Design an enzyme around this catalytic site. Structure first.
Site, PDB file in Angstrom:
ATOM      1  N   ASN B 187      -0.719   0.882   9.882  1.00 43.62           N
ATOM      2  CA  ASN B 187      -0.913   1.881  10.951  1.00 43.62           C
ATOM      3  C   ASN B 187      -2.237   2.662  10.826  1.00 43.62           C
ATOM      4  OD1 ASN B 187       2.453   2.537  10.067  1.00 43.62           O
ATOM      5  ND2 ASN B 187       1.908   1.272  11.852  1.00 43.62           N
ATOM      6  N   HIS B 189      -3.402   4.458   8.332  1.00 47.98           N
ATOM      7  CA  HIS B 189      -3.312   5.697   7.573  1.00 47.98           C
ATOM      8  C   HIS B 189      -3.628   5.372   6.107  1.00 47.98           C
ATOM      9  CE1 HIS B 189      -1.283   8.115  10.654  1.00 47.98           C
ATOM     10  NE2 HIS B 189      -0.871   6.927  11.101  1.00 47.98           N
ATOM     11  N   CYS B 224      -5.177  12.286   4.188  1.00 46.65           N
ATOM     12  CA  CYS B 224      -6.621  12.116   4.173  1.00 46.65           C
ATOM     13  C   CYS B 224      -6.956  11.128   5.295  1.00 46.65           C
ATOM     14  CB  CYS B 224      -7.072  11.605   2.807  1.00 46.65           C
ATOM     15  SG  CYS B 224      -8.788  11.026   2.736  1.00 46.65           S
TER      16      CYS B 224
END
Ligand SMILES: CN(C)S(=O)(=O)c1cccnc1
Ligand SMILES: CN(C)S(=O)(=O)c1cccnc1
EC number: 3.1.2.14
Lengths: 265, 266
Positions: B187, B189, B224
């Site tokens: 995804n 991330h 992050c």
């Protein structure tokens, strides 16, 4: 995995893992290159080479180093799919050795990828490249097919093309790349799959989102130390083709050069 | 792998790979954490989910996020060894859920590691944490043991210790850490295993060479982004060596993670 019936090649099956895939839910090219390295290591272990240094090589402090890596993918396996990889080696006269791979879909039996790599002998301490000796070649010839067996047979194909040096200014760049401990192998050297990732870092995200990587050719010139910093440079040369260059951030010393080819999804 | 007989836990065997090991020829803690995530994902798929989002969660745009990860290793498996991992989940009331793991040597049957993790519900779009509703809890309770089953049962244990915030100046630091595409999940991330590696980057190389990591506790405060830059900070707090850790954004110093590690002499 296991050696085939003749003992001249090795096969292994891998189930693609969740953290091994990208945004298309298919294995990344770095996952592929890790799997090629794993099946290559298992092939060397199965034939007694517990990398694959002969007894004469250990005596003279000699190791195999990758000079060139060439990968062509038709279909990236999806998450949860089983991929079968067959690997074998062949003597390349006296300039080095070659390791080839064939990737197949375990369910359909169809070829979904193929790779080739050129390895050269190097003194581990001085880093001086050498030509392969007669007594070195005869201790590994019995583990290779004698007739030529090529993953890339075609007369004048992408795997043996000369790669030029990228000229400044680069079209794209990713600067200040540093390896972490996860990028190091068991001997604390930067593993060769990290260089593939660093080369790909200067490709724009929009190209990655709209295209799939079909071919990657990498020439290895110098190793990157654990305390070294790298700059990744890319220029479009065209399907989309790119010319790549990895060099040390400071003095600009070349560590790698390569080319990629991408097709629209 | 496969669900056990009762369908309340999942087991999977892994053969340790060449590129998965460190200088000692044994699996790194990042390889371990990747294997825990993989067996967790396979457990969710085997019981009908697609990560662990219930039907009501998908309707309300809610996802499970890790709040805390705690790993204790007795023996790191060697290259070529088979490690067996058993995983299960348990509801923690409206606080969220817990996922636990047991790692065993497939040849000896002995426990060589154990892990626990706390998950909270979050709106995918606004990133706002929320308590578990009754509708959601009933949709996953049938897939969990009803009686408590804890990887860390002991009444005074490391997995539930409060972690303080590291004070400047840090004893050690690794600055300018950036994620690459390999550090991103499906995804896009940043993968939670990358934060473990970034935390470990500020530990001096001599500690890594002479000690083995026994315990790691990580609190996740903020994610992050792919275009974010991180600083990793460590201070010794202690035979055994203990460290306090902090990950924060390079610029404004916004906290992303905090943790503690414990190491023993080889
Ligand atoms: C015998 N094996 C095919 S191998 O991969 O271990 C090898 C290949 C070339 C040189 N030395 C060892
Ligand atoms: C295997 N399942 C118990 S699970 O991990 O999919 C799960 C756990 C908690 C909440 N929702 C889903």
């Amino acid at each position: 995995g296991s050696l085939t019936e003749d003992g001249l090649s090795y096969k292994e099956k891998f189930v693609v893992r969740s953290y091994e895939v990208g945004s298309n839910k298919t294995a990344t090219v770095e996952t592929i290159a890790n799997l090629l390295q794993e099946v290559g290591c298992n092939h060397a272990q199965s034939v007694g080479f517990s990398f694959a240094t002969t007894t004469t090589m250990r005596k003279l402090h000699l190791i195999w180093v990758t000079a060139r890596m060439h990968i062509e993918i038709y279909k990236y396996p999806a998450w949860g799919d089983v991929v079968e990889i067959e690997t074998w080696c062949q003597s390349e006269g006296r300039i080095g050795t070659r390791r080839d791979w064939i990737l197949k879909d375990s369910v359909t039996g169809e070829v979904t990828g193929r790779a080739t790599s050129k390895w050269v002998m190097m003194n581990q301490d001085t880093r001086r490249l050498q030509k392969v000796s007669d007594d070195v070649r005869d201790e590994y010839l019995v583990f290779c097919p004698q007739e030529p067996r090529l993953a890339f047979p075609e007369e004048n194909n992408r795997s043996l093309k000369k790669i030029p040096k990228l000229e400044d200014p680069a079209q794209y760049s990713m600067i200040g790349l540093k390896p972490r401990r996860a990028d190091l192998d068991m001997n604390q050297h930067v593993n060769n799959v990290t260089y593939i990732g660093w080369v790909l870092e200067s490709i724009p995200q929009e190209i990655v989102d709209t295209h799939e990587l079909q071919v990657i050719t990498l020439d290895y010139r110098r190793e990157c130390q654990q305390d070294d910093v790298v700059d990744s440079l890319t220029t479009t040369t065209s399907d989309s083709q790119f010319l790549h260059l990895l060099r040390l951030s400071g003095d600009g010393q070349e560590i790698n050069r390569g080319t990629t080819l991408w097709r629209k999804k």
